[PDB]
Ligand binder design. Structure first.
Ligand SMILES: CCCCCCCC/C=C\CCCCCCCC(=O)OC[C@H](COP(=O)(O)OCCN)OC(=O)CCCCCCC/C=C/CCCCCCCC
Ligand SMILES: CCCCCCCC/C=C\CCCCCCCC(=O)OC[C@H](COP(=O)(O)OCCN)OC(=O)CCCCCCC/C=C/CCCCCCCC
Lengths: 234, 234
């Protein structure tokens, strides 16, 4: 009757084979249990079942791990639905769309589905940026070695701008500091946080910040740096 | 009654399935134990339970490792809360926000949460810079081969500056030494320690140090080196 229920939406070949499989599986168990109720070589039957179930376990490890981790997700909620996810250790990055017992159905940002097994979440670090608070801005202003005299005041101006920018969160960090030399340039870091979590508003603020930086730089007399070389002709 | 407690904040589908699961799990155990109290094929039941629990263990390895490592963290305190962490072997880098029995909730420096399993801390080296004492400064002053005659005195001047800089810790190391040639440049190392652990003050001192280095170099007549080439035209 199970086979007939399987027959509506599947094939005869596979349903027949699956019938054979489940039939063998169900007869073998009761033969193993009542083979000594018949009284026929108990410990041989014991060995038979032992090695069979032993290989079966070594195989189905892969699947039961998925199932048990599905349970842990059912109770432990590292993420939920709609929560943008990623992992540094693997490509998972997408919005969750569905949880399952074996797997999860994520939608990437390609609008593609991704069917992930749940064993992975018990071995791997998971990042849920959808829960986050603020969004980061990071740059390196690459000036020239000619413009070294102008660095302190550029830096102070940039800082004073960010500190008086509406979109920016001043309770969080706010760092503008000449942090390294570099081949062909002097690199000023910028490290700031916007009080939005929205993609577009973050990007718009990033935009305004960058354009104001440009205006500041080119005002003070400096200019950005391309790569550079010294050619000793012959 | 457990199911009904689960029903308040979850669904009927999953709670029903979980009911089935726990029901099977609880009946099977007592059937296994009292199946011979009925007296029905003891050693067949023994095999059944053996292989079942064997696969179960091979699977739940992944989870029990997390739990036991959570216990070790409960007793052994490599880190605590508020302690910036990293590992060279993996991306974990963030401030701890919460410990758990299975996992930890870190906040990255993106203000993003990261849910890490605790099995990882028993396999991996962990660095707790939040406990540290002093912060390092490292650079390579890339001069030119033309400026080789000026290296000893530049070096000595730089050393004398750092040694008379307030923010610097002289009990720790302090190294300024011409350490390598390089394609296109002569590279002087700098390796020093600030007596702060704060990000911003460290960066400000880094700043002042670098600007003074620049002034020193350009005073003594040298200048920094871009990459370089010799072009043999034809
Ligand atoms: C480790 C050794 C074991 C190795 C693995 C051998 C295979 C084990 C048997 C297959 C696992 C169970 C598959 C899940 C479906 C259950 C079987 C089935 O026929 O249901 C089909 C059923 C569809 O329902 P209907 O078409 O309406 O049929 C109604 C039947 N009541 O399939 C489904 O997937 C239902 C939706 C669930 C999707 C989630 C992924 C599947 C897991 C479901 C629950 C957990 C079952 C597996 C773990 C059992 C642990 C005791
Ligand atoms: C290796 C084979 C085992 C494979 C794994 C099969 C699944 C095992 C069962 C699930 C593990 C236990 C989950 C932890 C919650 C306990 C079950 C539960 O219903 O509590 C929910 C409970 C929430 O509480 P209430 O909603 O108020 O309900 C009150 C119930 N007293 O869930 C919680 O997460 C509590 C907060 C703890 C968070 C820390 C992570 C979970 C671990 C908790 C403690 C350790 C339990 C697991 C190890 C047991 C070792 C004997």
């Amino acid at each position: 009757f199970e086979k007939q229920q399987i027959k509506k939406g599947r094939d005869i070949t596979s349903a027949r084979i699956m019938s054979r499989i489940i039939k063998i599986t169900i007869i073998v168990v009761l033969v193993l249990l009542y083979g000594e109720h018949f009284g026929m070589s108990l410990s041989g039957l014991l060995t038979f079942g032992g090695i069979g179930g032993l290989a079966v376990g070594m195989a189905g490890k892969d699947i039961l791990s998925n199932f048990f981790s599905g349970i842990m997700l059912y109770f432990d909620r590292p993420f939920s639905i709609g929560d943008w996810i990623r992992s540094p250790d693997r490509n998972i990055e997408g919005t969750v769309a569905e949880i399952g017992w074996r797997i999860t159905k994520i939608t990437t940002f390609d609008n593609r589905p991704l069917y992930v097994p749940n064993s992975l979440f018990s071995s791997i670090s998971v990042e849920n940026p959808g829960r986050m608070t603020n969004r980061r801005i990071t740059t390196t202003i690459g000036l020239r070695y000619e413009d070294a005299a102008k660095v302190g005041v550029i830096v102070e101006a940039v800082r004073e701008m960010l500190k008086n920018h509406p979109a920016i969160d001043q309770r969080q960090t706010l760092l503008v500091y000449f942090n390294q030399f570099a081949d062909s340039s002097l690199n000023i870091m910028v490290y700031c946080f916007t009080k939005t979590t929205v993609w577009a508003e973050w990007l718009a603020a990033q935009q305004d910040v960058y354009l104001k930086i440009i205006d500041i730089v080119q005002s003070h007399g400096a200019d950005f740096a391309f790569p550079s070389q010294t050619l000793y002709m012959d």
